[PDB]
Design a protein around this ligand. Structure first.
Ligand SMILES: Nc1ncnc2c1ncn2[C@@H]1O[C@H](COP(=O)(O)OP(=O)(O)O)[C@@H](O)[C@H]1O
Ligand SMILES: Nc1ncnc2c1ncn2[C@@H]1O[C@H](COP(=O)(O)OP(=O)(O)O)[C@@H](O)[C@H]1O
Ligand SMILES: Cc1cn([C@H]2C[C@H](O)[C@@H](COP(=O)(O)O)O2)c(=O)[nH]c1=O
Ligand SMILES: Cc1cn([C@H]2C[C@H](O)[C@@H](COP(=O)(O)O)O2)c(=O)[nH]c1=O
Ligand SMILES: N[C@@H](CC(=O)O)C(=O)O
Ligand SMILES: N[C@@H](CC(=O)O)C(=O)O
Lengths: 225, 225
């Protein structure tokens, strides 16, 4: 769903593609316009977060589906924040889809193809070279990101169910939010109907992906795509 | 592999059976004498730990395969401490069987049949009603148990590879070590040959289980069963 093109030493191009995959890449389709939607929405979220004092890798836009971002030394993690029970969480807790959590859950996943991104804890992370201090800073940022995104979306009648973040280290050794934030990497439910406005539409054939992504875009920006 | 028989309000009987199961109970066999070996070895480990200031549920012995233990409000957890890469850890870290960890790993598993004992972290635990303070005390005890067992066994030419503990709360709200500690719930390797003296012998047909358990017993006690 994304291509990364180096520029110099400091920055690279992050290009969003129309490709979609699910179930460990076993399900595939292409959706015209998805790259554009995901690019734009990432820009809006990064800008929101930056205003709130979150260090992100966003530098600028390079026309269309491409963003200019800061090159980072990436942590091999997917950091998942969860507010409402959905997806894989139903296999860890005996709780129904839609259950409102008493407080957010943060999950760590090790980004590894050989192993299919297994869940890990702080101890595995330490073995992978990530200190407890670093994990703690990462979860602190993720939880702050959760607060900002969920408040901002709740005002627009969207429940932030759960979402995935990734992080890297900059040249000062600061922890910087990286990758993307889009309906590919979040669960968004309509506050009223509880219906998915995200990649779950493609994952489980809940309707047309592009329509759902357009709706999200419109409900956030007030403008048509 | 064990039966629990209530006595009064304060205590129950923990009886060790000759039954063995593996792979989520799908593989089954019976080994004459296993109950006795596991009972005795649990007694030896609990006594060792008690001398070292670990609060356990051990009260006494009730002849043969039965122990008298303190009734506790059990945490729904299996707490796994790991020193050497083996078993399921090979699916979380790209490291070979026998890799020596730079420091111990503690893993939490939610004791739940519906869900087949999934791994969890501190956040899931909080949702299950287990405070961060409690998790922290539990991991502190487990790591202390690790130190004592590994030192004690290393002197006898046995590597403590990994092991599983369980815990409950007593009437004072103290966290007490519970269940069993036996070759069913630990990995024990000969320091020289690196060969299994534990349930892995049954799990993977590495030889005769009873012989392996007898050997452990003999190497710990200096006496024949
Ligand atoms: N600022 C950055 N600097 C360096 N690498 C990044 C940055 N942001 C994202 N990446 C990495 O680029 C890759 C993006 O490709 P892709 O596999 O499509 O995304 P992901 O796997 O993260 O969903 C990922 O490995 C991601 O960690
Ligand atoms: N001191 C104790 N008080 C109350 N329950 C206990 C105590 N020690 C162990 N138990 C519980 O008794 C059960 C033992 O049965 P079994 O299923 O054979 O063992 P386990 O499932 O723990 O391997 C477990 O649910 C265990 O948590
Ligand atoms: C598995 C996976 C989930 N996610 C996101 C989608 C969901 O919003 C959230 C939790 O997903 P899960 O329910 O599959 O664990 O993380 C990704 O962005 N990439 C992935 O590869
Ligand atoms: C799965 C499981 C493991 N264990 C023990 C055996 C191993 O010593 C240790 C780690 O096992 P694992 O490698 O299967 O995760 O925990 C149990 O006692 N009971 C169990 O049900
Ligand atoms: N459906 C997942 C892939 C997976 O389950 O591995 C996704 O978000 O792409
Ligand atoms: N083999 C495991 C069972 C499992 O894998 O679920 C055991 O220790 O009994």
């Amino acid at each position: 769903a994304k291509k990364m093109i180096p520029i110099d030493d400091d920055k690279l191009i992050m290009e969003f593609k129309d490709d979609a995959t699910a179930f460990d890449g076993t399900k595939k389709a292409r959706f015209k316009g998805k790259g554009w939607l995901n690019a734009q929405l990432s820009v809006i979220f990064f800008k929101l977060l930056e205003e709130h004092g979150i260090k992100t890798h966003f530098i600028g836009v390079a026309g269309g589906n491409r963003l200019i971002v800061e090159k980072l030394d990436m942590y091999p993690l997917e950091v998942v924040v969860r507010n409402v029970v959905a997806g894989s969480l139903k296999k860890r807790l005996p709780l129904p889809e839609g259950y409102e959590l008493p407080e957010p859950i943060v999950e760590l996943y090790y980004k590894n193809d050989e192993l299919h991104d297994p869940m890990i804890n702080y101890y595995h992370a330490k073995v992978l070279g990530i200190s407890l201090d670093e994990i703690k800073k990462i979860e602190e940022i993720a939880l702050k990101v959760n607060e900002i995104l969920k408040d901002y979306l709740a005002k627009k009648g969207i429940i932030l169910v759960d979402f995935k973040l990734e992080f890297g280290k900059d040249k000062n050794g600061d922890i910087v939010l990286a990758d993307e934030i889009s309906p590919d990497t979040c669960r968004f439910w309509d506050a009223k109907t509880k219906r998915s406005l995200d990649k779950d539409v493609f994952r489980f054939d809940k309707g047309d992906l592009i329509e759902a992504y357009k709706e999200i875009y419109e409900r956030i920006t007030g403008e048509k795509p």
